[PDB]
A and B are shown apart, each in its own frame.
With several copies, the nearest count.
Chain A
Amino acid sequence: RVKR
């Protein structure tokens, strides 16, 4: 999961 990557931060946006």
Chain B
Amino acid sequence: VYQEPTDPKFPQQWYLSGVTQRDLNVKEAWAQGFTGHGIVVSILDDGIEKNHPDLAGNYDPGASFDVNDQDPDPQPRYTQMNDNRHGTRCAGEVAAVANNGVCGVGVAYNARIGGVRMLDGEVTDAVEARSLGLNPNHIHIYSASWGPEDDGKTVDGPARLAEEAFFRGVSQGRGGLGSIFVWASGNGGREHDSCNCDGYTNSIYTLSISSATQFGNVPWYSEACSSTLATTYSSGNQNEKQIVTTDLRQKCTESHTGTSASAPLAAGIIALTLEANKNLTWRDMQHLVVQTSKPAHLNADDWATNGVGRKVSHSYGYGLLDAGAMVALAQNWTTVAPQRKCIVEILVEPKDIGKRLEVRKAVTACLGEPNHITRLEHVQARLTLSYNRRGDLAIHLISPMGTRSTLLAARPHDYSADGFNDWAFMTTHSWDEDPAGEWVLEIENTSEANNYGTLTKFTLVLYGTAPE
């Protein structure tokens, strides 16, 4: 009879297992024999305390590097305030050692954990590209808890080399199965930030993960957006428990917070899933998350059912990750058909936005062509527009099957007059729906100011597979 961890803080890890059956259902995966054996996970952050008593046992030099110092040692730079404890805390959540009488345990406590020190300095394009593409054939999963500023005023994403790294990793990583990039959706909730304005979380190459409080509420730091895929527990208000993990200076903390705690927990769960089926492709993994994530017990004011009967929320994606279900579905999973990419120009003849603009277009989804799609995966609405007050805009995309995705909600702190230039707002909400039919783009000025601008380009890019 499988014996759960004996670590001193395991009882405090309410999110791994805590009766109430209000957790990530990890114990069920462990019992089936899945704990991360043979899986390698790397934390792209400010470094990893490789000699930490609860990490040393699973530390992997091969999944580590210091890109900031161009050296193989990822040891964090120690400071009075412990500014560079971020990476270490994330590491522990993925693979803190189990049954060693120290702190708690990671989701994949038998996996190998490494760290890439790349945030402690100027984070250039080359630095991100080298981090994202480090040991594509040794590291299976990359966990990144960082991104553009979460002030609710910025629109930024990977540059040239990083963009190449993402595609390269997804195509050639893991011997062609594709690197798995797990991302924290963002902490700009209080600023009303939108994670669709974050090119890393908005990327189709990453599994953007959001948070939920112990009592199943939307955390105060949570950013809503249509690109989020799933959720994992994290910190909440003053009365809710937080995450337990390894901290700098060989310590143990019970107060790790934010979406930064959610991404690594997801990485751990994804690690268990890989052990259960090492042949899952980067796309297979996203399919598993969509099919097994549970919306139950997660409160939100926007749960909506899509065209294929699944509930989705802009705060939680498809719901809370379910380790047990993930592992179970992975075992007999048939790898998905080749990825098709259908590009359709909705308009290249300018249109005035004014107070509100609606663009409707009948789409055949490349019918009669090799990229014909009948089962959607990611959907990108590539917009190029000019507006005087960007944050006043709210953009929605409605699929033929009626699924209304909020590509962009109002951002009160965004006063930019720069608009958007070929920005690819991405939605996961129409996953598995048939794209054939009439699509509708909605752009509206949520303010009473008499704002103005022009939509000059709208390209709908559909990713997915052919009938089956």
Contacts and interface: CB of A to CB of B under 8 A. Distances in A.
Interface of A: 1-4
Nearest to B123: A1
B259 A4 contact: yes
- Counting chain B CB atoms within 10 Å of each CB, the highest count among A1, A2, A3 belongs to A3
A1 B332 CA distance: 39
B187 interface: yes
B404 interface: no
Interface of B: 45-46, 86, 119, 123, 128, 145-150, 184, 186-187, 258-260, 263
Contact of A1 (B119, B258, B260, B263): B119
Contacts, number: 29
B91 to A, nearest CB: 13
A2 B150 contact: yes
Nearest to A2: B149
A4 B123 contact: no
- Counting chain B CB atoms within 10 Å of each CB, the highest count among A1, A2, A3, A4 belongs to A4
Interchain residue pairs A-B with the least CB separation, the first 7: A4-B260, A1-B123, A4-B184, A3-B86, A4-B145, A3-B146, A4-B187
25 contacts: A1-B123, A1-B128, A1-B146, A1-B147, A1-B148, A2-B146, A2-B147, A2-B148, A2-B149, A3-B45, A3-B46, A3-B86, A3-B146, A3-B260, A4-B145, A4-B146, A4-B147, A4-B150, A4-B184, A4-B186, A4-B187, A4-B258, A4-B259, A4-B260, A4-B263
Given A2-B149, A4-B260, 18 more contacts: A1-B128, A1-B148, A2-B146, A2-B148, A2-B150, A3-B45, A3-B46, A3-B86, A3-B145, A3-B260, A4-B146, A4-B147, A4-B184, A4-B186, A4-B187, A4-B258, A4-B259, A4-B263
B160 to A, nearest CB: 16
Nearest to A1: B123
